[PDB]
Design a protein around this ligand. Structure first.
Ligand SMILES: CC(C)=CCC/C(C)=C/CC/C(C)=C/CSP(=O)(O)OP(=O)(O)O
Length: 512
């Protein structure tokens, strides 16, 4: 996975035929019919959840929303009322699909005195699991869902080792590591294909479609990786001391942000930006002198490369690649979207290098920022304002200066995502140490505080998605999915990473 000879040859061929593609068109039609067609409502919720978890929401979003809307406007509730598993699955799938369900659907499962969940639930594994997964769709002040999380976490930890079904035990272990709401879609799809195949409820048409679609999508990723590896070797940044494997790390993160084939060009551009972010992060952290870094920053602020030959080669090359790629991406927006994006790529790079320079000056002067002071800068230095403003530039319908100026100002929805990506990275001049310095907290207490900030910012993202937004798809999804990418990659670590890379990007799923 780390060999550019091997990567640069990916895309050359694929074992995905026109026969595979026709078969895929036929299976898609039956799955679409299964989602729209008759089924008992609990079975339909479980089917739609399986479609999502197999990575296929992008193929059936309209059918799934229509089916859930039907179910939501029912009037007949006997199928779910008094059933924890049914109540919790309904609550989750409706909230995920923009249909509001109040937290009070769970009040009947509580002790009316203490507000604690009933002891009699402690044995219901599938109920606890659905309640756990449901809890992460909660908003600020939804106290029943905060209790549901703490209760279902404690109970699932308790019962995990008591489960008889191996498949169910693996699912519970997976959930305790990360809830489904926090998992990167493409990576979870590869994991869940093998789990689903072993489920007793398993639908073989849906399994077969999931394997075939997985392989077809993966052939697009392999062509992208080819083009990106050839680009990267073209830049000569593969040969620089630092950011060993930056390209493939960037691309693997990009796949968490957006995996769909129709977003290939956008994904390649995000991946280039990410490769440069990680490369230049090393320049500012390890390699450059303060004078070199100040010049790098000043050149970028003025978007004026007159003085670039004052920098040494190993710094000039990253700078000019950043400049050239930013111009290319802004130009793509002009050619493809009618809107010159260079002012916006130049601006987010200037902002990011300013945030690196501030970190470098803090380090050099031995400054201890407050957690708030650190995060105000570190939500920029993490690179997600740069990555998200770029993704908006490339995907927004009818781009305008007004629209770009708004997204670039980092309203709550966007800022929440950036802060989350930063604090998740730090949990993986750092969040925990800053909070320790500010309050005298222990590492253990400081870590729990930062963890509570993750849960808080997630509740704000969740609520922002039920609110009318000036944003549309795919940007709404990008903002959530960069956070999932962060969770996934900040839980050998390199053996785990390579397996993820090999199973998701390199090896097709065996079809019979
Ligand atoms: C979504 C997408 C298109 C790609 C994202 C690309 C990447 C890799 C972005 C994350 C930024 C990182 C990991 C830089 C170091 S964080 P740090 O400086 O706090 O940590 P360090 O001290 O360098 O380990």
């Amino acid at each position: 996975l780390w060999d550019y000879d091997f990567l640069q040859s990916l895309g050359r061929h694929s074992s995905v035929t026109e026969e595979h593609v026709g078969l895929a068109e036929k299976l898609k039609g039956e799955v679409k019919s299964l989602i729209t067609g008759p089924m008992e409502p609990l079975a339909k919720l479980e089917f739609i959840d399986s479609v999502r978890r197999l990575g296929l929401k992008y193929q059936f979003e309209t059918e799934m929303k229509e089916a859930l809307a039907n179910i939501s406007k029912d009037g007949y509730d006997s199928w779910w009322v008094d059933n924890l598993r049914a109540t919790a699955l309904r609550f989750r799938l409706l909230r995920e699909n923009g249909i509001f369900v109040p937290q009070d659907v769970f009040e009947r499962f509580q002790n009316k005195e203490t507000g604690k969940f009933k002891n009699e639930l402690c044995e219901d594994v599938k109920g606890l699991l659905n309640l756990y997964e449901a809890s992460f769709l909660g908003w600020e002040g939804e106290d029943i869902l905060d209790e549901a999380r703490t209760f279902s976490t404690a109970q699932l930890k308790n019962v995990e080792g008591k489960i008889s079904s191996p498949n169910l035990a693996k699912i519970v272990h997976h959930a305790l590591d990360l809830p489904l709401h926090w998992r990167a879609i493409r990576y979870e799809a590869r994991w869940f294909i093998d789990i689903y195949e072993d489920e007793e409820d398993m639908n073989p048409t849906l399994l077969k479609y999931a394997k075939l679609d997985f392989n077809i999508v993966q052939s697009f990723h392999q062509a992208e990786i080819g083009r990106l590896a050839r680009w990267w070797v073209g830049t000569g940044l593969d040969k620089l001391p630092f950011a060993r494997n930056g390209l493939i790390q960037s691309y693997m993160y990009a796949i968490g942000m957006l995996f769909e084939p129709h977003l290939g060009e956008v994904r390649e551009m995000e991946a280039k930006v990410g490769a440069l972010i990680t490369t230049i992060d090393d320049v500012y952290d390890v390699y450059g002198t303060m004078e070199e870094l100040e010049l790098f920053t000043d050149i970028t602020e003025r978007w004026d490369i007159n003085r670039v030959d004052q920098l040494p080669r190993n710094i000039r090359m990253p700078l000019l690649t950043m400049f050239n790629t930013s111009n290319d991406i802004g130009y793509w927006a002009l050619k493809e979207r009618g809107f010159n994006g260079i002012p916006y790529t130049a601006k987010v790079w200037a902002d990011q290098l300013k945030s690196y320079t501030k970190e470098a000056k803090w380090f050099h002067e031995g400054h201890k920022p407050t957690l708030e002071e650190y995060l105000e800068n570190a939500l920029v230095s993490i690179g997600f304002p740069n990555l998200l403003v770029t993704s908006y530039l490339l995907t927004v319908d009818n781009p305008t200066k007004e629209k770009l100026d708004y997204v670039d100002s980092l309203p709550l929805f966007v800022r929440a995502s950036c802060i989350l990506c930063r604090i998740i990275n730090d949990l993986g001049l750092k969040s925990i140490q800053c909070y320790m310095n500010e309050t005298g907290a222990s590492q253990e207490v400081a870590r729990e505080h930062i963890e509570g900030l993750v849960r808080m910012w997630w509740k704000r993202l969740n609520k922002c998605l039920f609110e009318p937004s000036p944003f549309t798809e795919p940007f709404l999804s990008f903002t959530i999915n960069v956070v999932r990418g962060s969770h996934f990659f900040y839980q050998n670590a390199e053996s785990w990473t390579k397996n993820q890379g090999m199973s998701v990007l390199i090896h097709p799923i065996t079809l019979d």
